Design a protein around this ligand. Sequence first.
Ligand SMILES: *[C@@H]1O[C@H](CO[C@@H]2O[C@@H](C)[C@@H](O)[C@@H](O)[C@@H]2O)[C@@H](O[C@@H]2O[C@H](CO)[C@@H](O[C@@H]3O[C@H](CO[C@H]4O[C@H](CO)[C@@H](O)[C@H](O)[C@@H]4O[C@@H]4O[C@H](CO)[C@@H](O[C@@H]5O[C@H](CO)[C@H](O)[C@H](O)[C@H]5O)[C@H](O)[C@H]4NC(C)=O)[C@@H](O)[C@H](O[C@H]4O[C@H](CO)[C@@H](O)[C@H](O)[C@@H]4O[C@@H]4O[C@H](CO)[C@@H](O)[C@H](O)[C@H]4NC(C)=O)[C@@H]3O)[C@H](O)[C@H]2NC(C)=O)[C@H](O)[C@H]1NC(C)=O
Ligand SMILES: *[C@@H]1O[C@H](CO[C@@H]2O[C@@H](C)[C@@H](O)[C@@H](O)[C@@H]2O)[C@@H](O[C@@H]2O[C@H](CO)[C@@H](O[C@@H]3O[C@H](CO[C@H]4O[C@H](CO)[C@@H](O)[C@H](O)[C@@H]4O[C@@H]4O[C@H](CO)[C@@H](O[C@@H]5O[C@H](CO)[C@H](O)[C@H](O)[C@H]5O)[C@H](O)[C@H]4NC(C)=O)[C@@H](O)[C@H](O[C@H]4O[C@H](CO)[C@@H](O)[C@H](O)[C@@H]4O[C@@H]4O[C@H](CO)[C@@H](O)[C@H](O)[C@H]4NC(C)=O)[C@@H]3O)[C@H](O)[C@H]2NC(C)=O)[C@H](O)[C@H]1NC(C)=O
Lengths: 209, 207
Amino acid sequence: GASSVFLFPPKPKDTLMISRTPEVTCVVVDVSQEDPEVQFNWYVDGVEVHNAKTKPREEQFNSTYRVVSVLTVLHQDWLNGKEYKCKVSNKGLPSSIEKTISKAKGQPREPQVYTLPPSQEEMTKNQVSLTCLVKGFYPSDIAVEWESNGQPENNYKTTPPVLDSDGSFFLYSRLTVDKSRWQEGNVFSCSVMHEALHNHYTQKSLSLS
Amino acid sequence: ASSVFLFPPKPKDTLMISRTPEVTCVVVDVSQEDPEVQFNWYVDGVEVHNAKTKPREEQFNSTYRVVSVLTVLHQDWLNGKEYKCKVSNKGLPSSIEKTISKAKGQPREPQVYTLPPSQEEMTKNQVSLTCLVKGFYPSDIAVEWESNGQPENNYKTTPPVLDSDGSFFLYSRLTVDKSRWQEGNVFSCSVMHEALHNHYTQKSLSL
Ligand SMILES: *[C@@H]1O[C@H](CO[C@@H]2O[C@@H](C)[C@@H](O)[C@@H](O)[C@@H]2O)[C@@H](O[C@@H]2O[C@H](CO)[C@@H](O[C@@H]3O[C@H](CO[C@H]4O[C@H](CO)[C@@H](O)[C@H](O)[C@@H]4O[C@@H]4O[C@H](CO)[C@@H](O[C@@H]5O[C@H](CO)[C@H](O)[C@H](O)[C@H]5O)[C@H](O)[C@H]4NC(C)=O)[C@@H](O)[C@H](O[C@H]4O[C@H](CO)[C@@H](O)[C@H](O)[C@@H]4O[C@@H]4O[C@H](CO)[C@@H](O)[C@H](O)[C@H]4NC(C)=O)[C@@H]3O)[C@H](O)[C@H]2NC(C)=O)[C@H](O)[C@H]1NC(C)=O
Ligand SMILES: *[C@@H]1O[C@H](CO[C@@H]2O[C@@H](C)[C@@H](O)[C@@H](O)[C@@H]2O)[C@@H](O[C@@H]2O[C@H](CO)[C@@H](O[C@@H]3O[C@H](CO[C@H]4O[C@H](CO)[C@@H](O)[C@H](O)[C@@H]4O[C@@H]4O[C@H](CO)[C@@H](O[C@@H]5O[C@H](CO)[C@H](O)[C@H](O)[C@H]5O)[C@H](O)[C@H]4NC(C)=O)[C@@H](O)[C@H](O[C@H]4O[C@H](CO)[C@@H](O)[C@H](O)[C@@H]4O[C@@H]4O[C@H](CO)[C@@H](O)[C@H](O)[C@H]4NC(C)=O)[C@@H]3O)[C@H](O)[C@H]2NC(C)=O)[C@H](O)[C@H]1NC(C)=O
């Protein structure tokens, strides 16, 4: 049953800051009530590690169980491309299913980050859009946030990365703000976190001309 | 089971009275010895027989693929009728059904804005012209670029992204030589969507 194990990477922001906790997550679905205990062995570059935390089976609303195992990884190990392998078995049975994941391969490329004010036509509205164009980046793992006056501005949404013709990625993030706050000269800033940035972070600010 | 896919009509087809929208049922991983793949088609549960099915074509992995196309009425798709494909093999009992319809909900008009390149990008040989399309529902949309009446090809568009208010937005990025932008050429983003007048709007961008 190999189409029922899924292995997920850490969130981009978690791998870029050593104070955060990046985790690789091995999920087993379609677990039967007649299945003996689900068991996990984890390996980093083929060497077994023992710090994973496995949660008890959780029943889903389709008469199956789901079992999750979570492994904390060393930021540097993930970014250096180490391979993470989850081996799933049932207690007292011999067979197993194995899944592997690692960061995408290829030379990392630094994102270029541009901020764009609202279209003049949008200035007629009650709220305006501030746009952050992030391009030229590789791999696609990236985090984008906005702030103003120290505080996180959370009325924003960000597109998934999109693959460009030269093999790098781009995306846009759109922050929506009251026109009054923009008209008043408030400074807004787009922060971007990516492994190929110096100190893994950059920011670009934008305010009324 | 996972080997059948059912695709919606193209955004432009449902929106132009001159075009013909259709839904497309596709079956893959069809073994060489498999009996004839058959299709039954239903519109809101009612069987229809006007579909047109194409014979099995081999793929690089030595499996086969079969395709059935059903023409749909514009109003049927736009009114939210459900299209069901039922795939089976001649003389065998099982069947696999897939259904598709337009997302339900009050349609909402796309607000379309064009943005010039960032001043910081102006130092490069090529620059980015941006078209923001937001506030639209459902997500079916077509976005194109032109200059001086003529289609431009060097652009990429993000998929529609679900916004916190339940509508969608996207961005389209047209890459042009710095010299063409500085020459004062006029660029235009065009958007087709059901909640636009004439189903079409165009916004210009120039220096
Ligand atoms: C019974 O129910 C269960 C449970 O479902 C739930 O309950 C039922 C009752 C319904 O209510 C249902 O709606 C509920 O969701 C069913 O279980 C599901 O089983 C299917 C398979 O049958 C699984 O399908 C895969 O989904 C993957 C994506 O999963 C994520 O996204 C969906 C939403 O889009 C979420 O619902 C999932 O939970 C996953 O969400 C992610 O979860 C991660 C782990 O927790 C999160 O990461 C962690 O997050 C924490 C913070 O929270 C930390 O940050 C950690 O550091 C971090 O690790 C992550 O953030 C979160 N994301 C989101 C967006 O929420 C698909 O990737 C996968 O597709 C692959 O495989 C397909 C083949 O099946 C193939 O078609 C795809 O192309 C893709 O193939 C892969 O492609 C890549 C490259 O393209 C290759 O490299 C791969 O090799 C290749 N793999 C292949 C080919 O195998 C599947 O579609 C589904 O995930 C699972 N749901 C849950 C909740 O577990 C079950 O099926 C039901 N049984 C029945 C009906 O019989
Ligand atoms: C053997 O080979 C064959 C052939 O593949 C080719 O050869 C091999 C060797 C490879 O090199 C391969 O790269 C080659 O392409 C393999 O066949 C493939 O099989 C996989 C499954 O394993 C199929 O994957 C699904 O793809 C869906 C999208 O497919 C489209 O987009 C891809 C681009 O990546 C194209 O390749 C496809 O052709 C599809 O393209 C679309 O085609 C439509 C009709 O042909 C077009 O619409 C029509 O267009 C015409 C134009 O002439 C008219 O305008 C008509 O009016 C119009 O209707 C359409 O434009 C076109 N799109 C584009 C972009 O061009 C995925 O959607 C799908 O994912 C879903 O399903 C997964 C499993 O069920 C699931 O895990 C996913 O999460 C996802 O789930 C769905 O999600 C949506 C929303 O996200 C929900 O709405 C659904 O409910 C939900 N379903 C669920 C949950 O069940 C699949 O990943 C692949 O399409 C197929 N290729 C081809 C060419 O058919 C075969 O697998 C090989 N065998 C092996 C390896 O063993």
